[PDB]
Every structure is written in structure tokens, then in C-alpha cells.
Amino acid sequence: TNGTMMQYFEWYLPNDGNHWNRLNSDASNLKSKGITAVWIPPAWKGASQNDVGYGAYDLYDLGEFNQKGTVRTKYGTRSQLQAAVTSLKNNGIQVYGDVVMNHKGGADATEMVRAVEVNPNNRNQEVTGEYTIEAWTRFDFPGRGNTHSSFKWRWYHFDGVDWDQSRRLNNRIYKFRGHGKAWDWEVDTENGNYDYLMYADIDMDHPEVVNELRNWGVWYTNTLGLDGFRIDAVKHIKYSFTRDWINHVRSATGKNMFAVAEFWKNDLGAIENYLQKTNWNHSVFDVPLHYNLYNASKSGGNYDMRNIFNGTVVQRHPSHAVTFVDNHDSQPEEALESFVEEWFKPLAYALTLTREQGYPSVFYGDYYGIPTHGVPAMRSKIDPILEARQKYAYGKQNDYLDHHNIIGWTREGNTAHPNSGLATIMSDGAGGSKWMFVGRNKAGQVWSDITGNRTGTVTINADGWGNFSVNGGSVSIWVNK
Ligand SMILES: OC[C@H]1O[C@H](O[C@H]2[C@H](O)[C@@H](O)[C@@H](O[C@H]3[C@H](O)[C@@H](O)[C@@H](O[C@H]4[C@H](O)[C@@H](O)[C@@H](O[C@H]5[C@H](O)[C@@H](O)[C@@H](O)O[C@@H]5CO)O[C@@H]4CO)O[C@@H]3CO)O[C@@H]2CO)[C@H](O)[C@@H](O)[C@@H]1O
Ligand SMILES: OC[C@H]1O[C@H](O[C@H]2[C@H](O)[C@@H](O)[C@@H](O[C@H]3[C@H](O)[C@@H](O)[C@@H](O)O[C@@H]3CO)O[C@@H]2CO)[C@H](O)[C@@H](O)[C@@H]1O
Ligand SMILES: OC[C@H]1O[C@H](O)[C@H](O)[C@@H](O)[C@@H]1O
Ligand SMILES: OC[C@H]1O[C@H](O)[C@H](O)[C@@H](O)[C@@H]1O
Ligand SMILES: [Ca+2]
Ligand SMILES: [Ca+2]
Ligand SMILES: [Ca+2]
Ligand code: NA
Secondary structure (H helix, E strand, O other): OOOOEEEOOOOOOOOOOOHHHHHHHHHHHHHHHOOOEEEEOOOOEEOOOOOOOOOEEEOOOOOOOOEOOEOOOOOOOHHHHHHHHHHHHHOOOEEEEEEOOOEEOOOOEEEEEEEEEEEOOEEEEEOOOOEEEEEEEEEOOOOOOOOOOOOOEOHHHEEEEOOOOOOOOOOOEEEEOOOOOOOOOOOOOOOOOOOOOOOEEEOOOOHHHHHHHHHHHHHHHHHHOOOEEEEOOHHHOOHHHHHHHHHHHHHHHOOOOEEEEOOOOOOHHHHHHHHHHOOOOOEEEOHHHHHHHHHHHOOOOOOOHHHOOOOOHHHHOHHHEEEOOOOOOOOOOOOOOOOOOOOOHHHHHHHHHOOOOOEEEEEHHHHHOEHHHOEOOOHHHHHHHHHHHHHHOOOOEEEEOOOOOEEEEEEOOOOOOOOOOEEEEEEOOOOEEEEEEOOHHHOOOEEEEOOOOOOOEEEOOOOOEEEEEEOOOEEEEEEOO
16 A cells, blocks of 8 residues: 655666665665665666666676676676665565566677668658668677577567668668568557667567567566566557566566556557557556646646646556656656656655555656756655655545646545545645645644645644645645644
8 A cells, every 4th residue: 555666766877886785775764765666777788888778788687797898787786786676675675677678789790681671750661672781680698608598689589770780871760571570560650660669679579589588577587586567668569568478477476566667658548558458467657647747847837737637647547557757768868858847846746646546656866866967856855745645645535626726635544544644735836725625533633734845734624624725836735743
């Protein structure tokens, strides 16, 4: 009940290989703050040492083999990582490992491959005849040999690439030619077929590939003792594959692994399709909510706050929604930059942390800051919201998203939690107040703002109503503390 997930990394973390240790020694602190699950960054060897991990080179090298010019990953060695997991396990925190199965970058060598170019804006249309290119599709893993796995990757294990080493032409997408070669399906339909994204695109139609990735999922789960996954770029991956992959792993390990997929599209329709196609066997990040939050932080008070939840996954399918404010892609400078402004950030964290629907997530970047880009640590403002979730956010919810600026909602609390119950009120504009029902058994109680933004108190009247207030462009969470 009331769990809180935390993405434990940001894109511009320093390449000092001491991240696993930071996580190791921060376990006790996080669990006390209300964090119940940590989603760790790619644990495997990328195309280089300072690769964030998405340039997935070898999924069996968790900072254990000398490859790509280093033994450790950007975050550390395999032993440091496992010492980190142990620390989290001892503090009763679950561990979610990231998962990159859409592609493989940093190949060991090139191969001559027959292929055709396709239209970047419609990968279903071949724009050239068949011809030979030089693609980075060969993986032998010199530093690992056959340790853990003997599987070797070759061009026929992929559907295509975006780079021909023999000509070095820009803005090209190459679809490989051969027996049964075609972009995968089903996948997102933007650009005709969105199977191809970057690097060497893995072919989910090849049985050896499916078999291998499933086997790796199990090895990866048992090796680290993972409690779940954060699956990368699922809109570019065959939907049925991901579904059956997750099922395979849950079955082969006897664990009901939690799974949150990143279907990055600001479209609920597309996301619902993915959910239906994957038989609802796992959750998805609420990308639309993130954009609603972002757009609101950018409207200077003119966002109609009554709609903050329109078109969002948490509103339509709350059981399958992992709600977040920001991540490594939305942070400053990144490809999908859409950073929720600082002033609005705490309102955004109250919207995800104090409501009963959705599985909330805290971003490392917002919590500890992103010094390279001037983002201050906001844990001092997030901690109060975390405590409200851990101790107060329980019981029946009564919404009050009935004003273009000032919206709010209360939680009546339940006996399972001593003194539970809260009244969240926020304004993206001018301050004010709002009468809200918190429960008749609360009559006479004297409530205070756990964020400390408002210093007074609110006395619940004999009928269960309290007249709560909030400052402009701010959030207040009144509880019976
Ligand atoms: O430097 C010599 C190098 O040569 C060989 O490397 C080659 C690669 O193996 C080969 O795959 C190819 O790599 C290309 C890649 O195909 C191409 O897609 C591009 O990669 C970009 C993405 O396009 C871009 O979207 C971005 O992706 C990020 C994303 O922004 C972020 O949101 C998140 O999802 O993480 C993603 C991964 O970081 O960035 C990547 C990388 O900038 O460019 C690649 C080349 O830079 O071509 C390489 C040769 O040029 C050898 O294998 C290697 O050992 C040698 O070091
Ligand atoms: O974090 C520890 C906890 O995580 C997992 O539970 C999460 C669910 O997987 C996830 O679906 C979500 O469930 C809540 C819904 O989102 C919400 O709309 C409402 O229906 O309440 C649900 C929970 O009561 O969030 C939970 C975490 O609260 C995992 O399954 C647990 O085993 C693990 O202990
Ligand atoms: O190039 C040799 C062989 O490579 C791969 O196995 C192809 O799938 C196959 O069609 C081809 O004959
Ligand atoms: O388990 C299947 C069900 O999961 C969730 O409750 C969805 O909201 C619902 O649409 C779906 O039918
Ligand atoms: Ca294919
Ligand atoms: Ca793909
Ligand atoms: Ca407004
Ligand atoms: Na593919």
C-alpha cells in the first residue's frame, strides 16, 4: 500500500564510477523518506565508459569485463552494484532494473550487408534499390568470451541500422534484405512503422533473438535478484514480444516481477492500444500527465487546472499508470526536453504523490538537483510531500478540481493508518481558499500545513468541512499532525 518509486539517476551524472556506492549508502535514508523501490540506471556495458547505458553494447557485462576501454560502467563495477542491491534489499527496498532490448550499439566490427534505404518519415516505403552497405552489426564481446553466455550477434539478428560505414551518408535508415526481413509489427505507427529508432535495430522476428533475450532476462533477474523492470523504448519494439518476454521471466523465476514500460508518446490512444495489445500484463509511465504538468508550469497561471488530468493514463487506467514529473529525457538539454518548472514542481509532486491513483515516482534530478544545468536539489520541498504520502494519503478521496487556478482534493484516511487523512490544495495562480470535506469523524481536529508554506491552522467544523488556504503559485497539504 502506498509505495513510491525512485529513478536513481540523471543524464549528466559524473562519469566517476561511484554511483553504485552512492546508492549503497543512501539506502537507509531513502527508505526512511518513504521510497519503497529504486529503478537503477542501465547496469551493463555501454558503447563507452561515460555512456548513460542506453547505447547498450553488452547486457552480460555489468561492469565485470574489460571492454570498450574500461571494466566498470559509468556507475561502477559489478561488485559495487551488487553491494548496492544488497543494501537496498536489507532496507526493505525493491529493485527495478532497466531493460534495453530494442537495439545494440557499439558493435565490435562491421559486416557487409545487403539492404535498402527507406523513407525516414515512412519506413514502409523503400526509397532505393537493394545494395551493399557496411553496418555495425557484429558482436563477439572480446573481453567476456563465453562467460555467462556464448551467444554472438550478427547482421541477421537485426532489422536494420541508420549508418553505412562505407559511405557515411546522413539522415538514412537502412532496412536489411534477406529471408523474412521486415520491420517488426506491431510497433508504433508514427513514421509509418516505428520499429527503427537508433543503432542496430534488433529483429524480434528471429527466433534465436527471442530465445536469447528471454534467457538474458532470466539471467539478469537472478544475477541481481531484481524485483522488477523499467523497459526502455517499447513503442519501437514488437508489442507481442514485450508481453511474452515479461511473462516468460515471471514464469521462469517464479516471481511476479513488476514492470513499467516507457511508451514515449503524448497520446493516450496509442498508449491504450499498447496496453490492450500487451494484455494489460504491466504498467506504463504516464507520459501525457508529464506533458500536462509541463505545459501547466509553462502557462504562467493560465493553464486551466481543472484539466490537469485530461488525456492522462492515471485518469483512465489508474492501475497501470506509473506517474512521474520528469526523467532523464525531459531534463534540460536532452532530446525530449520538457522540464517542469521549479515553481510548479512541488505542485506536480503533490498531484502524483497525494492522490490515491497511479504508482508515483521521484526523479533523482529533482530530488538531488542537476548541478551541471543549474537545477537545485528540491528534496527539502519534496520530503514533506513524501511524508504526506507515507502517513496521510489514505482512505476515500474527494476531488475539487473545480476552479481554473485553485484545485484540491482530500483523503478521509483509514484505520490501517493512525491519524491518516489530508487536504491538498494548490494554485498555479493567485492564492485563495476552498471548503472541502475531510470526513465527519474529523470534526474539531486542528490541521496544519505539512509543507510549512502556510503557517496557520484549519479547524475541521462539526460537519467535516474545513476551509483550507494556499499561497499563489504554491501547494499546501493540510493534515492532522
Ligand atoms: O567512434 C567510433 C566507434 O565506431 C563504432 O560505433 C558505431 C556504432 O556501433 C554504430 O551503431 C553507429 O552508432 C550510431 C547510431 O547508429 C546512431 O543512431 C547515433 O546514435 C545516437 C542516437 O541516434 C541519438 O538518438 C542518441 O540516442 C540517445 C537518446 O538521445 C537518449 O534519449 C537515450 O535514449 O539514449 C540514447 C543513447 O545514448 O544518441 C546516440 C549517440 O549519440 O549515432 C551513433 C554514432 O555516434 O555508428 C558508430 C560509428 O560512428 C564502434 O562500434 C565503436 O566501438 C567506436 O567507438
Ligand atoms: O513499491 C512497492 C510495491 O510496488 C508495487 O505496487 C504498485 C503497483 O504495482 C502499481 O500498480 C500501483 O498500484 C496502485 C495503483 O496505481 C493505484 O491506482 C491504486 O489502485 O492503488 C494501487 C495500489 O494499492 O502502485 C503500487 C504501489 O503503491 C508492487 O506490486 C508491490 O508488490 C510492491 O510492494
Ligand atoms: O549468409 C548466410 C545465411 O545468413 C543468415 O543465416 C541468413 O538468415 C540466411 O538466409 C543466409 O543464407
Ligand atoms: O486487467 C484488465 C483491465 O485492467 C485495468 O483495470 C484496465 O483499466 C481495464 O480496461 C482492463 O480491462
Ligand atoms: Ca523484423
Ligand atoms: Ca525496434
Ligand atoms: Ca490556471
Ligand atoms: Na526490429
